[PDB]
């Protein structure tokens, strides 16, 4: 079996590092844990090292390793994230918060030893000072979404686009439109996938012992739509 497949037959330690900037508010966050592609499960815990976080944790969930997704036997041929490994791939997005600022992310997803790292850079501009983001008005829960993927031969990668639903404390809904593109880093061949989609679960938590502004995450991700 290919390397990408053999690397995710069991549990894999995970590292996540990020540095961000939002309307002159520069911060940095790091988290760690582990994942299991065989079951799509992700167990993580993110800590803010730069004092307190000036943005809500839900906004950054997508930013913070889709290679840990469950691809059934009937559609392993469409698993691009694993094929790109262990070489890695660069992930870029442009998050459009409706009636507010926007994020731009650049991330490298590669193996550093046996650990899988996700190093990121976050850029935020044009956010309203008393908006939902900079005003901390978003609830501390996450909904479910379906990510849609389609090949991109001319760029050798995948064109991913989806929209997230954030819940505000007043009972309203905020949209964050995600325009995403993933291109590998190694010359090794990759499996460009047909038009397929995913389905995600999430639930955010806390830790009574950790005294720093943090977050806990539990996710389940699976592919479907094709037989």
């Amino acid at each position: 079996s290919s390397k990408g497949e053999e690397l995710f037959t069991g549990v894999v330690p995970i590292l996540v590092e990020l540095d961000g900037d939002v309307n002159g508010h520069k911060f940095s966050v790091s988290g760690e844990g582990e994942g299991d592609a065989t079951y799509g499960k992700l167990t993580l815990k993110f800590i803010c090292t730069t004092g307190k976080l000036p943005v809500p944790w839900p906004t950054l969930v997508t930013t913070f390793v889709q290679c840990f997704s469950r691809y059934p036997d009937h559609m392993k041929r469409h698993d691009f994230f694993k094929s790109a490994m262990p070489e890695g791939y660069v992930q870029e997005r442009t998050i459009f918060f409706k009636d507010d600022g926007n994020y731009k992310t650049r991330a490298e997803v590669k193996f550093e030893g046996d650990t899988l790292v996700n190093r990121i850079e976050l850029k935020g501009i044009d956010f309203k000072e008393d908006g939902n983001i900079l005003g901390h008005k978003l609830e501390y829960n996450y909904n479910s979404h379906n990510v849609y993927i389609m090949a991109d031969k001319q760029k050798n990668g995948i064109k991913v686009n989806f929209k997230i639903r954030h819940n505000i404390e007043d009972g309203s809904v905020q949209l964050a439109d995600h325009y995403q593109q993933n291109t590998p880093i190694g010359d090794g061949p990759v499996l460009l996938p047909d038009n397929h989609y995913l389905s995600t679960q999430s639930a955010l938590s806390k830790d009574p012992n950790e005294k720093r502004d943090h977050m806990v995450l539990l996710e389940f991700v699976t592919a479907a739509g094709i037989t």
Binding site: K45, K211, L218, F220, T222, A224
Partner: protein, 320 residues
């Protein structure tokens, strides 16, 4: 656990126990005084007798029916005072009478934190033998180790870090599955219910990895079957997630909660159907599991079967 009485006969009893007048305490027992009398601040005769060091009085009040885990307003119990004041003889009797070994107070300080701050080597090893978990963190996150050093008790520091080390080895043994190593560490004083900074115990590790032999050994010595990590996952969840049938049986036989839910809201049955485990599903049903449990996103175990393309598993559930 906690009182708040009030009586003239009680006030006489507290003063009598504080000063250590053994006899006058006994006369008050027969004369109608309340053994569990509490004053304004919730202090009982057992509190004053434990801090005063009058073992005679302590023994009597336990025989009569004093609350060993009585928590005054500040969270202190007879074990806190008996430890803050270094009364080894009293710390040994309150433990024989089933006292909460790791009793947090208002500030999260457990009895061990106190035995470490002042450096009572005797009380320490006593509390450790009765299951006092080492990595007990308070409001300021200062474990007994982080607190023993701040006061210059270096022999305590080593004996603690030498214990925290054993616990980490117990997880590594259970994770990799070495039955002989895991037996060594338990015999050396490694708390079976030792949870690392992420809240996982060697019971989860022996269940998710499928090391049956190590499981019952942890349970036999008193491993918490319903132990939850920071994500609310139970050794029963991980036994179904991975699909190790034999461990699922043992966990239930020992009292594994079938209705448990992770931080998303997945029952052990939600996971068995997810991971496509034909037999694991029939076992959880055999033990009466909520057929129509809805996670945080309102999806039954039936739904998780279809979305993943699990034919037979879905059918089995639709029948039940």
């Amino acid at each position: 656990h906690h009182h708040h009485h009030g009586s003239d006969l009680g006030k006489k009893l507290l003063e009598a126990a504080r000063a250590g007048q053994d006899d006058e305490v006994r006369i008050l027992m027969a004369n109608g005084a309340d053994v569990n009398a509490a004053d304004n601040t919730g202090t009982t005769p057992l509190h004053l007798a434990a801090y005063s060091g009058h073992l005679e009085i302590v023994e009597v009040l336990l025989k009569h029916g004093a609350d060993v885990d009585a928590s005054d307003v500040f969270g202190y119990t007879p074990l806190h005072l008996a430890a803050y004041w270094g009364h080894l003889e009293i710390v040994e009797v309150l433990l024989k009478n089933g006292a909460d070994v790791n009793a947090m107070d208002s500030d999260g300080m457990t009895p061990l934190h106190l035995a470490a701050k002042w450096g009572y080597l005797e009380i320490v090893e006593v509390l450790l033998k009765h299951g006092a978990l080492v990595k007990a963190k308070d409001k300021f996150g200062k474990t007994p180790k982080d607190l023993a050093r701040d006061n210059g008790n270096q022999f305590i520091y080593e004996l603690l870090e030498k214990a925290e080390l054993l616990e980490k080895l117990l997880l590594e043994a259970a994770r990799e599955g070495h039955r002989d190593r895991v037996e060594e560490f338990i015999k050396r004083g490694a708390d079976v219910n030792a949870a690392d900074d992420v809240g996982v115990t060697p019971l989860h590790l022996a269940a998710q990895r499928g090391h049956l032999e190590i499981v019952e050994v942890l349970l036999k010595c008193g491993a918490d079957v319903n132990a939850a990590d920071l994500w609310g996952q139970t050794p029963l969840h991980l036994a179904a997630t991975a699909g190790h049938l034999e461990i699922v049986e043992v966990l239930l036989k020992n009292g594994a909660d079938v209705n448990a839910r992770d931080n998303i809201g997945h029952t052990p049955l939600h996971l068995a159907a997810w991971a496509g485990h034909l037999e694991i599903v029939e076992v959880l049903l055999k033990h009466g599991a909520d057929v129509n449990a809805q996670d945080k996103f309102g999806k039954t175990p039936f739904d998780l079967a279809i979305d993943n393309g699990n034919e037979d598993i879905a059918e089995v559930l639709q029948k039940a």
